[PDB]
Point group: C3
Chain length 112, copies 3
């Protein structure tokens, strides 16, 4: 099993959620985060008026899935989160050694 952690634009997140649900990926945890990327470099200026590059709001999605589903999930998120402009985000694939379902105590892919 792997944890897929994707940082996506808030405007794209509804489309990412719907693309996952259509393919039966219902379990997901979402956090409001802020981030920056390469765009902007060290500093910006406008006016002005020189400023740090701003940490701007993004949506973090975490979805833990079976190893065989990882590339399907990655593509569903990429196709739905993409816009073509800097700031579209990244997806990190993190190993998960086990999962426990709190309601029943079930572990393993069973737990997903």
């Amino acid at each position: 099993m792997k944890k897929i952690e994707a940082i996506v634009r808030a405007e794209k997140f509804p489309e990412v959620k719907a693309a996952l649900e259509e393919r039966g990926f219902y379990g997901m945890t979402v956090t409001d985060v802020k981030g920056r990327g390469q765009q902007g470099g060290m500093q910006i200026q406008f006016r002005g008026r020189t400023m740090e590059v701003t940490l701007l709001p993004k949506v973090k999605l975490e979805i833990v899935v079976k190893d065989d589903a990882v590339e399907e999930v990655i593509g569903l998120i990429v196709n739905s989160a993409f816009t073509g402009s800097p700031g579209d985000g990244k997806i990190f694939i993190i190993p998960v050694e086990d999962v426990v379902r709190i309601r029943t105590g079930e572990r393993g892919d069973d737990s997903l």
Copy 2:
């Protein structure tokens, strides 16, 4: 060492925190998140107009512990977070390769 990431009901979280503390697991990081599970399937209705399944508030607990403490901490969270209804949450066990204590630079199980 392992990172234990548990998504639990907000109403149960204070019981989880107290169960951990009673056994001397004091360090922990908590985030307000939103999530859905399998309950609801692809969509719901009510007096609609069908509606998406709502992402609802949950609490994310992250606790990094030595490997020999993982099973104990999983039991403390399962017992304290349980209600028996869908939405009780899941626990993910994620490998950690190292830990550093910022105050002193100490690494390894020592840093915990």
Copy 3:
């Protein structure tokens, strides 16, 4: 690749961000979190009833970098986040098996800059 997850004081986060940026680490994801550590033990004093130890606001920084950058980034965070009091934070190094750039679909060696 590794995910470096650091929990630091909010007062020090601007210095951490500046330290990273000065060395060219620009990609980062930050979350407001709350935490406690060992300080306070099982309960606090006042008044005159006991109170639980409070979960207080912190800043969580996640930065994913190539393996050859991990020690550099750790030192940049420790040296900018340090104050010398309990509550300074911890850094967790977590394996990452792959990274995908959404804009381009690149992965692996092409998904993070070489620093």
